[PDB]
């Protein structure tokens, strides 16, 4: 019956949401990994060049 | 209002569905007087209000139901309709102000949370963790309270009960969400981490990967702090090892890229002498053909065929170097070789053996390219030239003797005429290597 | 079951989205990193010239 189907419509939905959110997350964490490493690569560079 | 998780999977919503469909009266209990009256009142108002103004007037009230509470199903019910509150769209982050004004004020009912019975202990720990990691509120008196929790130990350590391991999984993984408050859920990872690998062995074998994903989420999230991904691998080898298998072997790619990027996570450079671990892994763990299989494998996600094709690069990087194959690299490059046993060895023979052909034989036209250009031009034998030959003689025999398919390029590479040619040479041993290779053609005919 | 292919465009349409929040992201991580480096270099010359 057509109740399983926006049932359905609204699980896609569901699925792309959790997909996204996930996605969403993993670039977060990717931010702060990315962040504090480039941060640490200029740190380097930076007392390199000051020593 | 800010920042309100866990909508996403279906057993929160079941559970939130389930919970909040128990059947309790706050005018029945104002009426015989088993609770505050006000309190009770502006209860009974606010689930009419709710189901069908502004908060912290019932904040207050609730408090008192909450510190004292001569009944199960009234906590539960104030715990519910708290947690209900705190997620709700009309409400939302004017409840949040209400945590976040007073700090102390979810301190209490943080105390009053996980106690007695499994399902007394799921939703105020629900709205406890909402809190915890909420806006502007943080505080390491929550972790370190949820983390010696003896009532919340066995519900995220129930292998029995998928649903309550879920919620305290989702929760402790949302509670991790700021690294920074991670560190007390690291230190008392060793708890966490058995339920782990429990989920990879149950892996190992409806929505029921959703749990070893957000597992797999809380490690790659904890494997984001170097330090804690210090101690990471460094730990667990067994349970370490399953990870590229059954994420491979995993349908969908979300549990098989968080497996792909933890393990990445953990032979990173950005880790302290990790190469041990990729040594290891790739060595009793035979990461080798693994990722030999997951590079020629395919992936939806972007992410997770890059960290793919990095991972195994970088496997590749050191896997190459145990033994070895790069050190005669260096000496084809330079042009010059020596006496070591690269050739000689039939472990490093097979080790690099693999390597011996990549695109019409480029390692191997490289190998001839050298003797070919030792052969056309200058082609003076004496001292260095001769030994070095002779070595690349019985080398690029060693690796005839070895691939079969590789006959056809010397021919067309005018080696086979070289070779021949160096049938008769100055020295003997020159000769003899040449004669050697010679017989090698003639091997098979 | 027009809601459902309704459902089903508008979940690509988040998805898209997603990622274009994650590309954003990313871009504005790289920028807080040269900002950092930024501060790193102002600091890093206060102390040269201290030293």
Request: with cysteine.
């Amino acid at each position: 019956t057509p109740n399983q189907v926006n049932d359905e419509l609204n699980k896609m939905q569901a699925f792309i949401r959790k997909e996204a959110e996930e996605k969403a997350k993993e670039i977060q964490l990717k931010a702060d990994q990315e962040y504090e490493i480039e941060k640490t690569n200029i740190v380097r560079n930076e007392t390199n060049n000051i020593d | 209002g800010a920042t309100k998780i866990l909508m996403d999977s279906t057993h929160f919503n079941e559970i939130r569905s389930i919970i909040r469909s128990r059947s309790v009266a706050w005018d029945a209990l104002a009426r015989s007087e088993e609770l505050s009256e006000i309190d009770a009142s502006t209860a009974k108002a606010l689930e009419s209000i709710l189901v069908k103004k502004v908060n912290g007037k019932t904040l207050i009230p609730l408090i008192h139901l909450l510190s004292t509470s001569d009944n199960e199903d009234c906590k539960k019910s104030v715990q519910n309709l708290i947690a209900e509150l705190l997620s709700s769209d009309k409400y939302g982050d004017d409840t949040v102000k209400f945590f976040q004004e007073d700090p102390k004020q979810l301190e209490q009912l943080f105390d009053v949370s996980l106690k007695g019975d499994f399902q007394t202990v799921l939703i105020s720990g629900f709205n406890v963790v909402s809190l915890l990691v909420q806006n502007g509120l943080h505080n390491v008196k929550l972790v370190e309270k949820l983390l010696k929790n003896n009532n919340l130990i066995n519900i995220l350590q129930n292998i029995e009960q998928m649903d309550t391991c879920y919620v305290c999984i989702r929760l402790l993984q949302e509670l991790a969400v700021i690294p920074e408050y991670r560190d007390v859920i690291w230190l008392h990872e060793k708890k966490f981490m058995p339920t782990l690998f429990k989920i990879l062995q149950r892996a190992t074998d409806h929505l029921g990967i959703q749990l070893q994903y957000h597992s797999l989420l809380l490690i790659w999230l904890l494997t984001f702090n170097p330090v804690f991904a210090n101690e990471l691998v460094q730990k667990y080898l067994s349970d370490f090892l399953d990870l590229l298998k059954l994420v491979k072997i995993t349908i969908k790619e979300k549990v098989s890229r968080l497996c792909i990027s933890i393990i990445l996570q953990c032979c990173s450079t950005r880790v302290k002498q990790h190469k041990k671990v990729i040594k290891q892994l790739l060595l009793l763990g035979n990461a080798l053909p693994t990722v030999q299989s997951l590079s020629e494998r395919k992936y939806s996600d972007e992410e997770l065929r890059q960290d793919i094709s990095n991972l195994k690069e970088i496997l590749e990087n050191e896997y190459q170097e145990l033994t070895s194959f790069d050190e005669y690299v260096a000496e084809l490059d330079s042009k010059l070789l020596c006496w070591s046993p690269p050739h000689v060895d039939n472990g490093f023979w097979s080790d690099n053996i693999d390597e011996f052909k990549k695109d019409n034989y480029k390692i191997f036209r490289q190998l001839i390219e050298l003797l070919q250009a030792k052969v056309r031009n200058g082609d003076v034998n004496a001292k260095q030239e001769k030994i070095i030959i002779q070595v690349a003689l019985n080398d690029i025999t060693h690796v005839v003797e070895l691939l079969p398919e590789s006959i056809d390029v010397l021919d067309k590479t005018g080696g086979k005429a070289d070779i021949m040619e160096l049938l008769n040479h100055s020295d003997s041993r020159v000769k003899y290597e040449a004669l050697k290779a010679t017989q090698a053609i003639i091997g098979y005919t | 079951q027009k809601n459902g292919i309704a459902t089903l465009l508008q979940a690509e349409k988040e998805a898209h989205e997603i990622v274009s929040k994650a590309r954003k992201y990313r871009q504005d991580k790289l920028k807080q990193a040269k900002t950092d480096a930024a501060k790193e270099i102002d600091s890093y010359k206060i102390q040269k010239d201290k030293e």
